[PDB]
């Protein structure tokens, strides 16, 4: 089997991707936040404190004749950004771009906090780390790519994010129409529950490439490129009037500049991020300071390779036995 779903930038910042999800019989579609940073398919729904839902459709397994409740089982977690969920669980049917898995685990919220509240486009999340990272309790539960990779025709899934425009994840092949020259995979380390690598070094604009190690994660629920202080101070430093701002909570530049892009390396090749990726607009609505797409990870304890990265690619994740991942120009 192959599933293949579109995924649409939920405001024209591309502050993140919804992606269309059925769940239970008949469908319920929720737009759920597909996140190789976490393992948990978590939704809103009737459940929910009726207080912390504002605008989001909900899951309601009363409605679904293949729900069941998944007895004793309750789950909490809390994201990189400090935003947090929890509730209990059910098993029901799940689709995804027409690639169904059954006795999927589905975690109703019975609290939110005031981020996902606040973001009414956002129904819940679908995470594609490692199993491993599951908070499940007393039972760990798989994602829904664990679930299906034996069924898929190849045991991958590929994100192929949009600048300001809708993109692609599929499961269980490799679109060869979707990507330029040739993919380059690189080794992954699951120590850590992440889909983690090591970036071969930089470039900033037209600058020399600096060949050095970066250890990050593959993050599509991170909207941002998180890297050393190092590399993103040199970044900064090609922009005119860029500071960094403990005000506002990183790096800020003129509106009025033109960014340079920013070069990574994957083994011998190299991915290219348009200045324009770069660009997350005013700090505030009006204001000519504009808040830049690369930041540090000091004090996030990890480099995360997010969205600005990762829309510049076409990325495969190989859930082989030895998992690896893929990076190609597009």
Known sequence: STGSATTTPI?????????????????????????????????????T????????????????????????????????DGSSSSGDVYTDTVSVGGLTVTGQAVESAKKVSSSFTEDSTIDGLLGLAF???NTVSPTQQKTFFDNAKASLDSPVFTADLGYHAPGTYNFGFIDTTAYTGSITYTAVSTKQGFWEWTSTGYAVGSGTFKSTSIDGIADTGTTLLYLPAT???????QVSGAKSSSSVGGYVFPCSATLPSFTFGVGSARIVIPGDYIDFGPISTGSSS????????????????????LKAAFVVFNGATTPTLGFASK
Request: glycine share 10%; hydrophobic share 35%.
């Open 131 to 133: 199993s491993t990272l």
């Open 231 to 237: 590399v993103v101070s040199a970044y900064w430093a």
């Open 11 to 47: 405001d024209s910042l591309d502050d993140a991707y919804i992606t269309p999800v059925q769940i239970g019989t008949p469908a319920q579609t929720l737009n759920l936040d597909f996140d190789t940073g976490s393992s948990d398919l978590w939704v809103f729904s009737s459940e």
């Open 290 to 309: 504009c808040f830049g797409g690369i930041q540090s990870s000091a004090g996030i304890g990890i480099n995360i390779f997010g969205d600005v990265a």
């Open 49 to 80: 404190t009726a207080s912390e839902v504002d605008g989001q459709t909900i899951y309601t397994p009363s409605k679904s004749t293949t729900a069941k409740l998944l007895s004793g089982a309750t789950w909490s977690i809390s994201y990189g």
